[PDB]
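Let us walk through a complete example step by step. Step one is to write down the protein sequence. Step two is to encode the small molecule, chloride ion, as a SMILES string so that its atoms and bonds are unambiguous. Step three, shown after the inputs, is the structure prediction itself.
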Amino acid sequence: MTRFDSATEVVRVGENRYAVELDPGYLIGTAMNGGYLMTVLQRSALAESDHLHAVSSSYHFHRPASSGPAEIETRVLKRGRTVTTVQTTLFQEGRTILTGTLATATLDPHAEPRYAAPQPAIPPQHQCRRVDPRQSHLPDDGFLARVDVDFSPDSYAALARERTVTTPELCGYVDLSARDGGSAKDPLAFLPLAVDALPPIVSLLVDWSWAPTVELTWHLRAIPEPGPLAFRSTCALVSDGWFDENVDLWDARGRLVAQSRQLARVGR
Amino acid sequence: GMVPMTRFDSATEVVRVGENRYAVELDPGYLIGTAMNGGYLMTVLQRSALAESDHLHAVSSSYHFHRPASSGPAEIETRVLKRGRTVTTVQTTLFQEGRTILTGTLATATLDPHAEPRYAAPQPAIPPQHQCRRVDPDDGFLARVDVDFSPDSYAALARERTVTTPELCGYVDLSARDGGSAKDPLAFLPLAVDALPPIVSLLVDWSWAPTVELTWHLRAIPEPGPLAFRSTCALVSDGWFDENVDLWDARGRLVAQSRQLARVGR
Ligand SMILES: [Cl-]
Ligand SMILES: [Cl-]
Ligand SMILES: [Cl-]
Ligand SMILES: [Cl-]
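Step three: the predicted structure of the complex.
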């Protein structure tokens, strides 16, 4: 087992009802990381579905969650031969935290694209640079110790402020941490965390290092084989406190597997 | 003279029939075959959502399309999920003939009309509207909008060009035929993001291309007038494609970012 496998398990407690334990190791401060809460909700949805994969998932974040127990309430909105859509909502201390709606279907793992834009040039993982997480009061050194994130030299330079930031862009490789048990066993389970496992892109543009997510929708495009994911994060506009963070993930083979866009407002 | 209001203004109004309950008439003029255009269905849901909100604007709207709608009456059911000082989130579902058509969840907030970007990537180069081309010809959806394509985009659609990267750009607006430019562009954005030819047309022949999910974000209050657009797509595989539409207003300000995931087949 990897820490993630244990941390993200959801137990069926009743019909359309699940129980989960939020692992404080995924705290980014006083709130749980959003991607971790997505991972748990994704599990609830596929448990209720006749299809294997979460092909489009839209999540609306209402309030921060903390460690300990949380409860999940699911609802199938539409069942179909190709697409089955499930609504899943997370509760904690009598309050709604987050709601997701997921279009589930079963993708062909050997499907050949009819068209595919090339993966943008990203340096090999060995030429990339990682920042060793220092110790933290957060349980087991909090969120930053749950994932290994390798940045291209330019991305590192950007985050470390040792270079000019003309256009906001980060890239490199991401995976579950070596510390917690190595690469994800089930990549698909990890994608919802992966899309939200990187430094907020806004940190490169205004002087806020984070924002609570308001909305994130992400799409599964191909079935990835296990291993670290190549990532690229961009932003087209910061205005009236609002910013867009666009994260794409590719696999070892250069196959686009995830396209994510979240919207968040600074100072909330 | 001119009509004091557009077809769109009448066609997309919603009546409150009870608590968290609205009635709406789907205008057959917005049909693409037997199924109502998705953006028109979004416009109507957005109205119901804002009617239930203490905030003015639909900042993030995520929509899941369960089944196609036909013309005639439909009923809308709303639900406030979260109320806040900055954000209020409203769920809204559309029903027709006892069946769930579409469900949207909208993060609503009030954006500052005078707010200026702290950062902005550049609008892509798009020829002016006068150098663009409109298809010369249909009492359905294509007559509800006026869509001008860059010469290269027109050439691509007309198959007069070798397409490499699937891209379309130009200007879009409510049609002259229907009363001219949108009088409330904020109400028109949910239709605009889904008012273009499917991007997958450039890559494959297709007989059906239904939207599965669309999420779009409102980035600035647009000034009235035709919207500059750009539509792109990164992968068409296993019968699915992504359609990414960005919209800018007359002053080159980014106002909408849309991504939909859709099926494609023959
Ligand atoms: Cl925090
Ligand atoms: Cl059903
Ligand atoms: Cl079906
Ligand atoms: Cl509330």
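Step four is interpretation. Chain A touches chain B through 49 residues (CB under 8 Å).
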